[PDB]
Amino acid sequence: RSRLTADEYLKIYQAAESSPCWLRLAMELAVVTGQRVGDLCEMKWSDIVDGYLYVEQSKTGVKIAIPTALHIDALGISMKETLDKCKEILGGETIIASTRREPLSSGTVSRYFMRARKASGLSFEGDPPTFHELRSLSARLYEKQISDKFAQHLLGHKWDKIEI
Amino acid sequence: RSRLTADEYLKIYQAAESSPCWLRLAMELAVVTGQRVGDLCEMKWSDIVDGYLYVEQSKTGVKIAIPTALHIDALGISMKETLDKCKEILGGETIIASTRREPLSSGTVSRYFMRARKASGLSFEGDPPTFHELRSLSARLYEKQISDKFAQHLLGHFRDDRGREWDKIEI
Amino acid sequence: RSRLTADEYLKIYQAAESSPCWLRLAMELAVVTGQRVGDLCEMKWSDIVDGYLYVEQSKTGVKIAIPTALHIDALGISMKETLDKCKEILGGETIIASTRREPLSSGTVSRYFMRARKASGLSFEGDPPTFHELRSLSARLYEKQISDKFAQHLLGHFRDDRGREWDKIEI
Amino acid sequence: RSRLTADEYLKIYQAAESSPCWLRLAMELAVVTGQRVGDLCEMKWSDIVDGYLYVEQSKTGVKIAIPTALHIDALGISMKETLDKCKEILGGETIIASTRREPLSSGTVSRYFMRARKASGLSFEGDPPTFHELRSLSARLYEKQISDKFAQHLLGHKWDKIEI
Amino acid sequence: RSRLTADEYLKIYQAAESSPCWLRLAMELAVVTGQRVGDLCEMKWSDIVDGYLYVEQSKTGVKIAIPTALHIDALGISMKETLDKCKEILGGETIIASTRREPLSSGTVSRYFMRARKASGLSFEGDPPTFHELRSLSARLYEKQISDKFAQHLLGHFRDDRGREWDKIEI
Amino acid sequence: RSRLTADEYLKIYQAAESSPCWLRLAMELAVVTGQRVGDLCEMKWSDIVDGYLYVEQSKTGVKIAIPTALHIDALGISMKETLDKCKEILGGETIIASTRREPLSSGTVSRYFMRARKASGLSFEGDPPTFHELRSLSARLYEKQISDKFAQHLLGHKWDKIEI
């Protein structure tokens, strides 16, 4: 299906204005960490140790340690800043959490992103991009900003520490 | 005049996507060093000696030695990384330089920042923040991360060289 | 500082005969739009949509939509005519531009205006009026021609676009 | 006889400092409207209707409607501004009027212009220009500023509305 | 802000050894004429007539005729000698000009002066003196050499030409 | 022996900070007048008449009149300014004088300059320059700034008035 460009992300992010607060935060976390929505929903505060967010991908078993100093230039996302916002605004045991501080599921996150997407009025060639497409956007952005190698390493394609 | 928060800095930073390459770098350098724009524009590579960026403030005459190991945690800004980028991307005699490696003036930096600010679409209570507001942001962020004493020290509110005395910034 | 009257504006305008082509046009645009020089220098052709010149004041953040049908009767200044001249004679990305189609800075505009002012040979009580005085002139002329409310509106003292709200100027 | 250049007009205008107030106003009106002195003296406020000054030339019968929005760049003359000054300063039934608010004749206007001309100290090759030469100056100035066609149309050489 | 003494002027002058050729000349012209930097940058060769440099101050409108025979004894500055050097070394339409004979702006002059000031290594009580401090120095030196009346006259605190009246400076 | 460059003069001048006040003043006077130390020590206030310092060189008999308006650009030395400082700070019958206002000898001046030189930490190829080398520095500086002819005229190599 259709991909998601940076400009399109900005339009959806804007429409997410009237969405629950965690949606915009989940979008930021998805692009800056490049992790699958299933893993994003599993992330907990105890997973962060000494400036590194440890992630064992549920689907692949790939274990990586993501530096919280990461940032995506094109969208102006600072991983630390996003994490600070998740801590203060959401305040759950899970980094990403509902308004009632409960863990979120992939279906719920994807569903709300879809609503924000419709609210933006964007048109796409073929099936509109889902929340999952934020992972490809992350790779494409990190490739230009750093390197295709870095993008691949971060996505889990190769605890394996992520550096740069 | 309105202040600029860390989240607002990031919106403007994003909006700077279509600005000259030096804008984002000047923004980062302003927040991590806390120096006035006039002084940012004066900084040269020869001012860095043994991991320290020597700055004599143009307006006040205050002489400080800034450790290049500094980081602004809230925004993920590393002074060393930023300087590396300035060297690799701008490559002028001055740390901040145009695409043609020429020095920049305070007016030009402020002007481009103002344009990126408008592009972000942010709304402000009162007059919008200018590039100068990045110095106040630096202070508030450093006050939290390190201390009110550190911030006042960095802002300019003793490695004695060949005559002149410099205030060494620590931690 | 001294004010500038309509008759004095014309003496300086005459004196601008030997000034760059953009000076007279910048003078006309300053009086008919009432915008600060910093904003005049920022205006671009892309800011004009369906007979309206959109302006976000750099200093205040005030967003207004100026109808291009405006006229300053006292001096025979037509905004549309002036814009046509700017397009045909200057032809830059910015409405006001140099002979090389480059953007102009507030300092340059003020400097050339100051020179034309001296060339006119006018005498003033107190410090002579600067290019900024054209904004006050705009207000006084509009206050008489239309209303004190209109002038304050134009000076910056609701076409809602993609997010941002604009104050539409009427009559 | 000799012509009158823009710089020469400025010198005479300067010397007109000590001349009756209507002289400078008549000079401005002469250059911006390009009309003969005989017609200038006949102009009345009732001749202006909806931003147009209607003039039927006495000598030729040519009927033209001059837009009050006209202006001469070289000399910084705004027709509306000059008319506003004539209204406030002179205040007669005729646009151009004496100090005692009475109509002026061509001879009087020409005579005072001649005195201002002498007072300026200018030297000319051949007979000095008279007030009549302001009409040629008008044409030469409007030609450069707009076009020879416009100059001719305004002078009455071709109610005929004047536009541009 | 700190004042600048005659001895300090010489230290900065020495330090200007590696500055553009126009810096030392602009410094000399500032002290011997006592004019604001904005006006120094505006001066042209056509302004000198029969041994007098005609200056209409941009800010105040004050019109003075400065005799080119002036000297600043305390520093050995001769106005005629300085002007000769400006003509021979700079050779622009403006008395003070860049290496490419282009006019200079107040900001550029101040900026280079500030750099020479730092290079001298002088220490100051309070904010260091800027190029503007050369005008106060001119006044204090002239007050001693000639009189308080002369200084106030020169600073701008009657050869009547074609309309405009000029204040002739004497002795 | 080794020569003295302008940069070296600046370093020694800086080290002269802790030297008697007359040393720095003697250094300035030596470079701006280009006279031998023996003559510098003989200079008196009565030798200055109408902006000219009259000097009859002891060794050669050469009589020259040095304009007090002279200045050395490279070192920022104004002869008048230096003389003003000698008058106010030293206040002796001799232009150059000791702390107790007594005349100085060549040996004393040379000796203190040597101490300031050592204090600067400079290294030289061959024998370090003595106070006498300030005379050569003067010539080399005046040559570039004005002309070799001027340098020679000032040094006494050709009352003979010095001009320019």
Curated annotation (Swiss-Prot), chains A, D, F:
Homotetramer. Interacts (via N-terminus) with the excisionase (via C-terminus). Part of the excision complex made of the integrase tetramer, IHF, Fis and Xis. This is Integrase. Residues 1-164 form the Tyr recombinase domain. Integrase is necessary for integration of the phage into the host genome by site-specific recombination. In conjunction with excisionase, integrase is also necessary for excision of the prophage from the host genome. The gene is int. The active site is at R36, K59, H132, R135, H157. Belongs to the 'phage' integrase family. It comes from Escherichia phage lambda (Bacteriophage lambda).
